[PDB]
Design a protein around this ligand. Structure first.
Ligand SMILES: Nc1ncnc2c1ncn2[C@H]1C[C@H](OC(=O)[C@@H](N)Cc2ccccc2)[C@@H](CO)O1
Ligand SMILES: Nc1ncnc2c1ncn2[C@H]1C[C@H](OC(=O)[C@@H](N)Cc2ccccc2)[C@@H](CO)O1
Lengths: 231, 231
């Protein structure tokens, strides 16, 4: 059954109880406060809803996921990256990035003003991180998400220049993999997610990786704002 | 003579040369950078100064200290905690905890903007940690400090609801003891700190503990964001 959240509790219902159709719908209401969001991510839940509607929480089954090493990179893209015109930094402009994704008319709809301020908050508290792609001094691409130990929950990505988000993702994965990263959550499997090399795994499996991975960890300074790639 | 620290290098004078009145006043100037602060904690020094004043570094003698096990808990508090209405978490909102302490108009003036930023960096690098106390969807209390092996240097705590900060310390001590935490530095002795069970030990006694406990270690992932207690 669909649980109505309220200001009284920050907890969530067991995901095993999410609806079948729409795939994942678990609860609604509450708010997008930091503590509630973390509470959600740690239980394999995430918010998604359009402007005007109440907050919706999901935990779909199967779950979209991306194993860093299985990231698909075309022969063409490698040639591009070997002579990349982009620079990739970490946590330099979280705001510009999420704003870029929100700006995307075709996919940024669910990124309302309330969602933006919410994740910016998680960013300032150090749980949300952004990968930025620069061409000269102009942000032309990026991605962002929530970290859970060796698990990364991908929120969204955007691009204003050819191959910008592929670079963000290509570089992040190298970094992530090289320091102990394990999995990237793509939430739902679709044309975009599938093109990156994401695959579906049962929810029960995702939750078990979740509880396992948020306990594991990366270098003390892994999420510190820095440059990840420069030509 | 109060040594005037140099910007050029990170280096403190022996705590023994500190003044006797004001207790511990040992040095001034320098900066609030990660390496200098981390250095301060190593040697038993800590910054404390009011806005519109130069950086002041202290090493009081005697030093206030709290042995995890000697933490005092009244019968009413136990009765209260048994049916606690609070949720306690670790490293969920460091920024919000420190900001809470800094907002306490009674004893938070010393937590200047430069200090908040300074400790945000330590939290970023994984040395500074917080403990948040939630009532429903609200942050009603908490505490934060700098980890030093098995020793925890408490910096400050705040409270917006009866027994909030006691709950924070109570859950912390249990968790801390459970994984080998040995001592909690309280810096100076006050009424609240003493009521909790804190006490005074000579500076040179504290310094030996520090040098010893700094070496000891806690479980690699003791500080990962998580829930320590839920109502
Ligand atoms: N159904 C649904 N729920 C939530 N977000 C959704 C969604 N359909 C699309 N989107 C978002 C996310 C997606 O980007 C992604 O590929 C992410 N799901 C995963 C990701 C994020 C960041 C780095 C790597 C992987 C965008 C479309 O670009 O829209
Ligand atoms: N002289 C002096 N030096 C440092 N901090 C001081 C201070 N006078 C007041 N305060 C702060 C800290 C104090 O809280 C504490 O007891 C901490 N020193 C130790 C602590 C911190 C967090 C958790 C556990 C223990 C507060 C009083 O509320 O003001």
């Amino acid at each position: 059954r669909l649980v109505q959240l309220s200001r009284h509790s920050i907890a969530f219902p067991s995901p095993e109880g999410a609806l079948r159709e729409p795939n994942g719908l678990l609860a609604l209401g509450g708010d997008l406060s930091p503590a509630r969001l973390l509470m959600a991510y740690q239980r394999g839940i995430f918010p998604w809803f359009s402007p005007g509607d109440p907050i919706l929480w999901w935990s779909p089954d199967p779950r979209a996921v991306l194993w860093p090493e299985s990231l698909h990179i075309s022969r063409s893209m490698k040639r591009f990256h070997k002579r990349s015109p982009y620079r990739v930094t970490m946590n330099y402009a979280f705001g510009q990035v999420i704003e870029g994704c929100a700006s995307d008319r075709e996919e940024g709809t669910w990124i309302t003003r309330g969602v933006v301020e919410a994740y910016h908050r998680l960013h300032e508290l150090g749980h949300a991180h952004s990968i930025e792609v620069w061409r000269e001094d102009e942000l032309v691409g990026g991605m962002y998400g929530v970290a859970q130990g060796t698990l990364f929950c991908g929120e969204s990505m955007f691009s204003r220049m050819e191959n910008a988000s592929k670079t963000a993702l290509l570089v992040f994965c190298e970094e992530f993999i090289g320091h102990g990263g394990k999995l990237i959550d793509c939430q739902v499997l679709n044309d975009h997610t599938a093109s990156l090399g994401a695959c579906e795994i049962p929810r029960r499996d995702y939750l078990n990786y979740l509880n396992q991975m948020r306990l594991g960890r990366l270098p003390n300074n892994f999420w510190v704002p820095r440059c990840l790639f420069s030509p």
